[PDB]
Amino acid sequence: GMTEYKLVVVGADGVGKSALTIQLIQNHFVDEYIEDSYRKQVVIDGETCLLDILDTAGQEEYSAMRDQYMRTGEGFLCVFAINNTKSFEDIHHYREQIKRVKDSDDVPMVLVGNKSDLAARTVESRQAQDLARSYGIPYIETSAKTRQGVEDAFYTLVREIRQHKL
């Protein structure tokens, strides 16, 4: 058949989880936006695959069932917004929960600084890049509005999942 990658997009409210997902999957920008899954057949490095993307929403809770559902993700996009310092400060907490339910410090993960089209940046690229380095994961800046970096962000995550097999 065709290889499938289960991706989970996580991060603080309003950082653009839905806009990034809808931009990648449906190819347009939503100005106002529900937890749901989005799927698309794509080409990464010449190989065709199916992406199954969970756009997370709702309440923070740690029931057995919620843990088990997140545990089915194979890679995680940890998203903050480059104009929202609190969303960046929360990144450590999201990585902590991923490592906990996946029971591994070697989870395919990408740090995404979204809304890079905005002028009013509060998180310098270099501080997010250095944070990603301390985690050992790539850092990619995106704009769901312009589509800049969006494919690079999700596809790099797939590449991490692939390299994480071997």
Ligand X SMILES: Nc1nc2c(ncn2[C@@H]2O[C@H](COP(=O)(O)OP(=O)(O)NP(=O)(O)O)[C@@H](O)[C@H]2O)c(=O)[nH]1
In this chain, which of 8, 15, 49, 131 binds ligand X, going by CB under 6 A? 15
d(CA 14, CA 88): 12
C-beta closer to ligand X: residue 49 or 144: 144
Cβ(115)–Cβ(83) under 8 Å? yes
67 binds, among Mg ion, ligand A1CG4, ligand X, none (CB under 5 to 8 A by kind): ligand A1CG4
d(CA 43, CA 1): 15
Instruction: Determine how many CB atoms are found less than 10 A away from the CB of residue 59.
Output: 5
Q: Does 145 bind ligand X (CB under 6 A)?
A: yes
Mark the segment that binds ligand A1CG4 (CB under 6 A) among 18-26, 41-49, 65-73, 152-160: 65-73
The order of strands in the sheet holding 109-114 is 36-44, 47-55, 4-11, 75-81, 109-114, 139-141
Q: Does 10 bind ligand A1CG4 (CB under 6 A)?
A: yes
Residues in contact with ligand A1CG4 by CB under 6 A are 10, 12-13, 56-62, 66-67, 70, 90, 93-94, 97-98, 101
